[PDB]
């Protein structure tokens, strides 16, 4: 797996080179292009590259090796990097809105001295780079428009998910009544499940020439369920994770977020425990945040998570057995293995 | 002209209706859709609608009236509203980054209590709505991909212009040496000239089936020059404009912006006057901002602007005479008339 990763990261230098080549033809925007490189180098590198690697691995498993030529394989890891750019755009913006401190083992881009809210445009430039690369490498391809629409839809989906997340998590207002299982499943479906799990497999499918409605609908049933689990896992790691491993500091309690943990807490809270949560949740005070963590540990939520993860993996495996065909089960199995029991 | 405007604004209620119809099929995202309507109602309404109206007026002048059917005309004002959505996205984001107080006669969306930096996602949703409308009304059209790429390119262009603007205007740092005419022309070309003047005429050209490289290149020569003047006019109105008319408070001096006014000031400043500008520019202090305004008025920059506007209009008119053909000169003349001597 570490060999798959290294080949993918080795292509980033050319991705930057092609995206910052504009300085030759237009020396006037030289500084802007130099800032884009700085934004690319900081915000697209450091992660696990699960989405980008999924595009590359799913492409090799869906396309016949006699068809996988040098150009065809370059297009596959360029689209992989396009998904990594979509990730970069989403995270730079989300770290501002969530008032987060760290990302991928370093300070958040907006928290850097000399950046600040300029990071909003930087996030937008990262998004702009997807369509630049799609045009430079896939314009003459039959799946060109299908990939453009798939990335556009992925953006709208996450942004609607982001609207739901932000409306359920108001700063200064107690929203315990909206923290339900039905609300949670609606948020994470749009917010994470589509771009993190459906988008990479669907992009590799369109590139393989699998554009069928039924085929895409079947992959979606598995992948949207995989995405729900991945977000539940991220919600657990925000509180019970190790920041040296995760590369980020948790803010869900301070930010009044509709975390899977608070949904589970409210399902098992006594009237007394509900007031402890009402009085201490969604506030900046360290002592208040510590009080909520103590209640989660008291309701044995880390073990509730361990049981969920076991039942969830068995459900996703049952979904692979039901809907994988005619695609190789390894397509969905490889991604499932890379996220199950994850600590990063 | 006021009759052209009223018909265009009357179509906004249907634009909202089609974009917020998702609540029927998906009641789970109801609140998110309700927030999108609130974002659309606040941020896409209030302006002069020059870009949206340009798409509609240029379409009727380029397409034969026997071909202008009910569906064909609906597609024209939908693409007009798509340009107004691109404007909304840019302004919501720019008002955060510029730390502006008002927009279109009301408080900035991000300055609204309960909104704040959530406005970043709201800006992104406005951008998402362009491609939603392009898909719902122009997917079966021969110019579909051409319009998608034209809006994508318009975004990258403005965002690169925005990178240049923000890098030349650092908070806390004296950047008088970079405030040159060559730097100014580079910023506003990418930042404003492409999306505000080229994008509306080019979209109406593609819809009329005029996709020729030479035809688009010729319109670009006129329109990019028109855009340079429009930004110069906006830079003048930031200081010498009336906020009841403009609907916005100026921040260029406080924000250390490479304004056309500071470029002209530095070209006419004595060594003594240069130090007055160096000591008082780019700071929040009201007295410091007032000192810079006094120097501009002392160098007679409002009259320097009046002479520029006269020479600029004659240059753009000469460009219409050179490059309008085979397009009707009214296409470029109508837009020129709507921005020349502007106070809004
Ligand atoms: O990495 P983070 O900040 O923990 C997160 O997962 C980031 C994110 C951004 C956009 C879409 N989905 C997740 P969040 O939702 O704020 O918990
Ligand atoms: O409306 P504003 O804020 O005066 C402006 O024109 C807004 C704007 C946003 C995006 C592109 N071009 C202009 P700016 O450049 O900040 O002076
Ligand atoms: C969808 C959510 C959970 C955001 C972060 O995802 P990752 O955990 O995949 O972050 P990176 O690997 O890209 O750094
Ligand atoms: C390109 C710049 C100068 C931003 C504002 O343009 P407008 O003056 O056209 O603003 P609205 O009419 O859309 O409100
Ligand atoms: Mg976050
Ligand atoms: Mg978030
Ligand atoms: Mg999280
Ligand atoms: Mg501004
Ligand atoms: Mg600005
Ligand atoms: Mg201005």
Swiss-Prot record, chains A, B:
As cofactor, the record names:
Mg(2+)
Binding-site positions, isopentenyl diphosphate: 48, 51, 87, 104
**In this chain, where does the modification N6-acetyllysine occur?**
48, 278
Q: How is its activity regulated?
A: Inactivated by interferon-induced RSAD2. This inactivation may result of disruption of lipid rafts at the plasma membrane, and thus have an antiviral effect since many enveloped viruses need lipid rafts to bud efficiently out of the cell.
Q: Which reaction does it catalyse?
A: isopentenyl diphosphate + dimethylallyl diphosphate = (2E)-geranyl diphosphate + diphosphate; isopentenyl diphosphate + (2E)-geranyl diphosphate = (2E,6E)-farnesyl diphosphate + diphosphate
Site Important for determining product chain length: give positions: 89-90
Pathway where it operates: Isoprenoid biosynthesis; farnesyl diphosphate biosynthesis; farnesyl diphosphate from geranyl diphosphate and isopentenyl diphosphate: step 1/1; Isoprenoid biosynthesis; geranyl diphosphate biosynthesis; geranyl diphosphate from dimethylallyl diphosphate and isopentenyl diphosphate: step 1/1
How and how many cofactors are bound, per the record note?
Binds 2 Mg(2+) ions per subunit.
Gene Ontology molecular functions: (2E,6E)-farnesyl diphosphate synthase activity; dimethylallyltranstransferase activity; metal ion binding; RNA binding
Q: Where does Mg(2+) 1 bind?
A: 94, 98
Query: Any idea of its EC number?
Result: 2.5.1.10, 2.5.1.1
One Gene Ontology CC term in the entry: cytosol
The yes or no answer to whether the keyword Cytoplasm is present is yes
Q: Where in the cell is it found?
A: Cytoplasm
Keywords of this entry: Acetylation, Cholesterol biosynthesis, Cholesterol metabolism, Cytoplasm, Disease variant, Host-virus interaction, Hydroxylation, Isoprene biosynthesis, Lipid biosynthesis, Lipid metabolism, Magnesium, Metal-binding, Steroid biosynthesis, Steroid metabolism, Sterol biosynthesis, Sterol metabolism, Transferase
Q: Which family does it belong to?
A: Belongs to the FPP/GGPP synthase family.
Q: What role does this protein play? A: Key enzyme in isoprenoid biosynthesis which catalyzes the formation of farnesyl diphosphate (FPP), a precursor for several classes of essential metabolites including sterols, dolichols, carotenoids, and ubiquinones. FPP also serves as substrate for protein farnesylation and geranylgeranylation. Catalyzes the sequential condensation of isopentenyl pyrophosphate with the allylic pyrophosphates, dimethylallyl pyrophosphate, and then with the resultant geranylpyrophosphate to the ultimate product farnesyl pyrophosphate.
Q: How does it assemble?
A: Homodimer. Interacts with RSAD2.
Q: What is this protein called?
A: Farnesyl pyrophosphate synthase
Residues shown, of full length = 76 to 419 of 419
């Amino acid at each position: 797996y570490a060999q798959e990763k290294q080949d993918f990261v080795q292509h980033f230098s050319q991705i930057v080179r092609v995206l910052t080549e504009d300085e030759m033809g237009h020396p006037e925007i030289g500084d802007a292009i130099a800032r884009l490189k700085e934004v690319l180098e900081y915000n697209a590198i450091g992660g696990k590259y699960n989405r980008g690697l999924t595009v590359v691995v799913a492409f090799r498993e869906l396309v016949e090796p006699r068809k996988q030529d040098a150009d065809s394989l370059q297009r596959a890891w360029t689209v992989g990097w396009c998904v990594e750019l979509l990730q970069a755009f989403f995270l730079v913006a989300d770290d501002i809105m969530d008032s987060s401190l760290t990302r991928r083992g370093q300070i958040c881009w907006y928290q850097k001295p000399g950046v600040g809210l300029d990071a909003i445009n930087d996030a937008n430039l990262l998004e702009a780079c997807i369509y630049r690369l799609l045009k430079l490498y896939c314009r003459e391809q039959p799946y060109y428009l299908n990939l453009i629409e798939l990335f556009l839809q992925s953006s709208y989906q996450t942004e609607i998910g982001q609207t739901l997340d932000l409306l359920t998590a108001p700063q200064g207002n107690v929203d315990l009544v909206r923290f339900t299982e039905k609300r949670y499943k609606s948020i994470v479906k749009y917010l994470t499940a589509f771009y993190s799990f459906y988008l990479p497999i669907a992009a590799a499918m369109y590139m393989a020439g699998i554009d069928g409605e039924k085929e895409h609908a079947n992959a979606k049933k598995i992948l949207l369920e995989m995405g729900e689990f991945f977000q539940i896992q991220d919600d657990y790691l925000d509180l019970f994770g190790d920041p040296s491993v995760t590369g980020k500091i948790g803010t869900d309690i301070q930010d009044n977020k509709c975390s899977w943990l608070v949904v589970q807490c409210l399902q098992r809270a006594t009237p007394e425990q509900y007031q402890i949560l009402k009085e201490n949740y969604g506030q900046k005070e360290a002592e208040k945040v510590a009080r909520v963590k103590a209640l989660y540990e008291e309701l044995d939520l880390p073990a509730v998570f361990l049981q969920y993860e076991e039942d969830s993996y068995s459900h996703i495996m049952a979904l692979i057995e039901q809907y994988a065909a005619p695609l190789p089960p390894a397509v969905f199995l490889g991604l499932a293995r890379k996220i199950y029991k994850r600590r990063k």
